[PDB]
Scaffold this active site. Structure first.
Site, PDB file in Angstrom:
ATOM      1  CG  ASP A 129     -27.226 -37.661   7.587  1.00  0.00           C
ATOM      2  OD1 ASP A 129     -26.232 -37.388   6.876  1.00  0.00           O
ATOM      3  OD2 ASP A 129     -28.322 -37.067   7.491  1.00  0.00           O
ATOM      4  CG  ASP A 147     -30.162 -31.371  11.139  1.00  0.00           C
ATOM      5  OD1 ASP A 147     -31.363 -31.470  11.459  1.00  0.00           O
ATOM      6  OD2 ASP A 147     -29.289 -32.202  11.472  1.00  0.00           O
TER       7      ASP A 147
HETATM    8  C1  LIG Z   1     -27.427 -22.455   7.460  1.00  0.00           C
HETATM    9  O1  LIG Z   1     -28.283 -22.305   8.586  1.00  0.00           O
HETATM   10  C2  LIG Z   1     -27.634 -21.833   9.803  1.00  0.00           C
HETATM   11  C3  LIG Z   1     -28.804 -21.484  10.850  1.00  0.00           C
HETATM   12  O2  LIG Z   1     -29.967 -21.792  10.607  1.00  0.00           O
HETATM   13  N1  LIG Z   1     -28.443 -20.848  12.076  1.00  0.00           N
HETATM   14  C4  LIG Z   1     -29.454 -20.541  13.105  1.00  0.00           C
HETATM   15  C5  LIG Z   1     -28.699 -19.921  14.240  1.00  0.00           C
HETATM   16  N2  LIG Z   1     -28.804 -19.407  15.446  1.00  0.00           N
HETATM   17  N3  LIG Z   1     -27.645 -19.015  15.925  1.00  0.00           N
HETATM   18  C6  LIG Z   1     -26.716 -19.286  14.967  1.00  0.00           C
HETATM   19  N4  LIG Z   1     -25.417 -18.965  15.230  1.00  0.00           N
HETATM   20  C7  LIG Z   1     -24.308 -19.124  14.420  1.00  0.00           C
HETATM   21  O3  LIG Z   1     -24.359 -19.581  13.292  1.00  0.00           O
HETATM   22  C8  LIG Z   1     -22.963 -18.697  14.988  1.00  0.00           C
HETATM   23  C9  LIG Z   1     -21.788 -18.854  14.176  1.00  0.00           C
HETATM   24  C10 LIG Z   1     -20.514 -18.473  14.648  1.00  0.00           C
HETATM   25  C11 LIG Z   1     -20.318 -17.908  15.968  1.00  0.00           C
HETATM   26  N5  LIG Z   1     -18.969 -17.519  16.405  1.00  0.00           N
HETATM   27  C12 LIG Z   1     -17.874 -18.443  15.896  1.00  0.00           C
HETATM   28  C13 LIG Z   1     -17.079 -19.323  16.914  1.00  0.00           C
HETATM   29  N6  LIG Z   1     -16.794 -18.639  18.188  1.00  0.00           N
HETATM   30  C14 LIG Z   1     -16.046 -19.507  19.102  1.00  0.00           C
HETATM   31  C15 LIG Z   1     -18.047 -18.183  18.799  1.00  0.00           C
HETATM   32  C16 LIG Z   1     -18.866 -17.233  17.877  1.00  0.00           C
HETATM   33  C17 LIG Z   1     -21.519 -17.763  16.765  1.00  0.00           C
HETATM   34  C18 LIG Z   1     -22.800 -18.150  16.283  1.00  0.00           C
HETATM   35  C19 LIG Z   1     -27.407 -19.876  13.873  1.00  0.00           C
HETATM   36  C20 LIG Z   1     -27.121 -20.429  12.525  1.00  0.00           C
HETATM   37  C21 LIG Z   1     -26.708 -22.910  10.415  1.00  0.00           C
HETATM   38  C22 LIG Z   1     -25.295 -22.766  10.404  1.00  0.00           C
HETATM   39  C23 LIG Z   1     -24.464 -23.751  10.987  1.00  0.00           C
HETATM   40  C24 LIG Z   1     -25.033 -24.904  11.595  1.00  0.00           C
HETATM   41  C25 LIG Z   1     -26.441 -25.061  11.609  1.00  0.00           C
HETATM   42  C26 LIG Z   1     -27.264 -24.078  11.028  1.00  0.00           C
END
Ligand SMILES: CO[C@@H](C(=O)N1Cc2[nH]nc(NC(=O)c3ccc(N4CCN(C)CC4)cc3)c2C1)c1ccccc1
Length: 249
Positions: A129, A147
């Site tokens: 999913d 994921d």
């Molecule tokens: C738990 O693993 C992580 C993982 O492996 N990862 C690999 C990977 N690569 N880059 C990532 N970037 C971010 O998580 C992120 C979060 C907030 C961010 N800000 C907030 C909103 N703003 C508008 C812009 C800037 C900018 C970048 C991740 C997470 C994961 C987290 C979420 C979804 C999928 C995977």
């Protein structure tokens, strides 16, 4: 490969088995994400071997719409994944922000997903999913399947599960129907007030379109949201659907 070849930055978020930080590759001044997965925590969820399987797969998956897994390595009590860095965050956030996406952002997002999913369908690789919480955005506003659910209890998952999974390459298609609907409305199609109820809506495929849902948009979510996987279109169809080509790009 080892930990010394990376400069660690600020923590990016927590995971089921560890944290993930923004890092820089010393030898190349290259930015990326270092995901730490604690072996013990893994051994506890009976995933220590499965994880090894996905990582294997995802490591041969090179596509603009799929979080690039550059490499990985282990040590004492933890596991590391050299991941591509998505600067715009998750799709769930951008949605928890704009309440709902417009017909075009929607159509484009489904396209990117449809493409990546195809690239995998063409390598004997499938996906489970798909949740918005697992979709990251690249520099260009490009979606990224992040994921690690590739293949060759649980909270907030039911709303994204298809019939068979609560009663093969067809689950993804249900996901698109669900992702497309949420993307447009703001909430998933079978979200209810209580667990039991939710279940019944997903099972009997009971959902309704809010006034504003364009009709072309209604033709696709309906063809995707089939209780019978057999009738769920091919990705080729989705990709060539009148409304997709019409508002996508
Ligand atoms: C738990 O693993 C992580 C993982 O492996 N990862 C690999 C990977 N690569 N880059 C990532 N970037 C971010 O998580 C992120 C979060 C907030 C961010 N800000 C907030 C909103 N703003 C508008 C812009 C800037 C900018 C970048 C991740 C997470 C994961 C987290 C979420 C979804 C999928 C995977």
């Amino acid at each position: 490969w080892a930990l010394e070849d990376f400069e660690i930055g600020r923590p990016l978020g927590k995971g089921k088995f560890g944290n993930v930080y923004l890092a820089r590759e010393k030898q190349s001044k290259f930015i990326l994400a270092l995901k730490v997965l604690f072996k013990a925590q893994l051994e506890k969820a009976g995933v220590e071997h499965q994880l090894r399987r996905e990582v294997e797969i995802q490591s041969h998956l090179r596509h603009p719409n799929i979080l690039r897994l550059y490499g990985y390595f282990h040590d004492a009590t933890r596991v590391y994944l050299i991941l591509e860095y998505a600067p715009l965050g998750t799709v769930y956030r951008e949605l928890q922000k704009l309440s709902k996406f417009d017909e075009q952002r929607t159509a484009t997002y489904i396209t990117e997903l449809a493409n990546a999913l195809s690239y995998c369908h063409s390598k004997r690789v499938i996906h489970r999913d798909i949740k918005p919480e697992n979709l990251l955005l690249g520099s260009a506003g490009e979606l990224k399947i992040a994921d690690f659910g590739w293949s060759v209890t649980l909270c907030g998952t039911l709303d994204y599960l298809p019939p068979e999974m609560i009663e093969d390459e067809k689950v993804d298609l249900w996901s698109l129907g669900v992702l497309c609907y949420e993307f447009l409305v703001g909430k998933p199609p079978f979200e209810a007030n209580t667990y039991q109820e939710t279940y019944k809506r997903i099972s009997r495929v009971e959902f309704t379109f809010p006034d504003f849902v364009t009709e072309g948009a209604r033709d696709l979510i309906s063809r995707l949201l089939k209780h019978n996987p057999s009738q769920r279109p091919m990705l080729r169809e989705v990709l060539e659907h009148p409304w997709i080509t019409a508002n996508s790009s």
